[model samples]
Target: QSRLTFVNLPVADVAASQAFFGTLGFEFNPKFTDESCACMVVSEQAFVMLIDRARFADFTSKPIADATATTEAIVCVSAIDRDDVDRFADTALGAGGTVARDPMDYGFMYGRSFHDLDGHLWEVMWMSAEAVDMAQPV
Candidate 1:
C-alpha cells in the first residue's frame, strides 16, 4: 500500500512553508529536499509536496492560483478524537496561522479549520464509531 501521498501544491516560498508546518509539529524528509520543493510529512500515511511554482508548473499545463486570495483547495487531516482536532487548530494558530471558526459539534463529528501562512486551508476532524454508522442520521 502507498504509505504517503498527497496533492503537490505550488508555493512561493519553500522556507516559509517549512517553517509554518514545522511549528505545527510536521517534520521534513530530506530525501525529497530540493531548491524547488520540500516534502511536507503529514503523517506515516499522508504527505503533501510543497513544490515551488516554477517546478510545479512543469507538471501542469495551466497557471497556478494564489491560494491566499483564492480557494484553490481544502486539505483535511483526520484526528483520533475531538480534542485532537482542537489541538491541531491551536497549534496552527500558535504557529501564526488563523483559525477559520470556533469548534462546532454536529452530534456525530467535531471539527475546526486553520489557514496557514500561505492561506492554504486545513481541516482537523474527529468522528466517533457510532458516527460511522451510515444508517444513522448525520
Candidate 2:
C-alpha cells in the first residue's frame, strides 16, 4: 500500500495560514515547520505542508497558480458522522473561512465545503457503510 505523507500547498502568508488552520484545531509539527513552511498534521500518518508561494515556486518549472483566483484542487476529508461534517465546516466559518458551497445530501452521503484564508477549498463529508449497496447500478 502506498502511503501519502504530504500534500504541499502554496500560501500567501505562512503565519496567517498557520493561525487559520489552528482555529480548525489542527496542530503542526515544529520539526518540519519554519519561516517559509508549516507541516499541518491531519493524522499521525498524514500531513499537509503549507509553503510560502515564493518558496513553493522552487519545486516546479511552471508558474504557481493563485488558489484564490483559480480552482486548483479541492482537498476533502472524511467525518465521523453527518453532524460532524456540519460542525467542522461551521467552525471554519466562525474562524473567518468562507462558504464554498451549500450542504449536499445523497441519502448515504452528506458533505459541505469551505475556503480557507488562502482560498484553498476544503470539504468535509460522511458516508454510510451501505453507500456501495445503495449506489448499485440500476
Candidate 3:
C-alpha cells in the first residue's frame, strides 16, 4: 500500500509562501525545505511541496498552470470536526488567503475553500461518520 502522498505546487516566492501558510498553523519540515522549496507537513502521510517556479520547471517541461488565471486543482484536506473547518477557513482569510466561496453544508458534510497566496485552491472539509453510514447503500 502507498504510505505517503506528496503534492507539488508552484509558488512565486518561497519565503512568502512559507510565511503565508505558517500563519495558518501549517508546519514545515526543515529536512526537506530551503530557499527554493518547502515541505509542508499536511499530515503524517501527506505533504505539500511548495517549490519555486524555477525549481518546479526543472521537474517538468510542460508549462505550469497560472492558478491565478485558471483552475488547476483543488487540494482538499479533511478536518477533524465541523468547527475545525470553519476555524481553518477563518484563519486562511486572516492570513491573506482569499476565500474561494462561502461555506457549504450538505447533510453529511461541511466544507470551505480558500486560495493561497499563489492562488492555489485549498479546501477544508468535515464529514460526519454517522451520516456516512446512512448515506451508504445497504
Deviating ranges (above 4 Å) for candidate 3: 132-138
Candidate 1, TM-score vs. the true structure?
Answer: 0.81
TM-score of each: 0.81, 0.87, 0.90
lDDT (tens digit, per residue) of candidate 1 on 25-75: 778889986888889888787788988888989998988877777886799
Which consecutive 10 residues in model 1 have the weakest lDDT in total? 129-138
Query: How many angstroms is residue 5 displaced in model 2 relative to the true structure, after the best TM-score fit?
Result: 2.7
Indicate which candidate wins on lDDT. Answer: 3
* 1 versus 3: better TM-score goes to: 3
- What are the RMSDs of all candidates, in order? 4.0, 3.8, 3.3
List ranges where model 1 is wrong by over 4 Å.
1-4, 133-138
- Quantify how close model 2 is to the true structure by its C-alpha RMSD in Å: 3.8
**lDDT of candidates 1 onward, in order:** 0.81, 0.89, 0.91
Model 2, global lDDT: 0.89
Q: Which segments of model 2 are wrong by more than 4 Å?
A: 130-138
> What count of clashes does model 3 give?
0
Residue pairs with backbone atoms closer than 3 Å in model 1 (clashes): none
lDDT of 2 at 75: 90
Q: Return the clash pairs for model 2, or none.
A: none
lDDT of 2 by residue, 1-138 (tens): 557779899998999998888877789999999999999999988899999999999999999887778897889988888888888899999888998988899968999999988889999999996663334555
The local lDDT score (0 to 100) that residue 111 gets in candidate 2 is 95
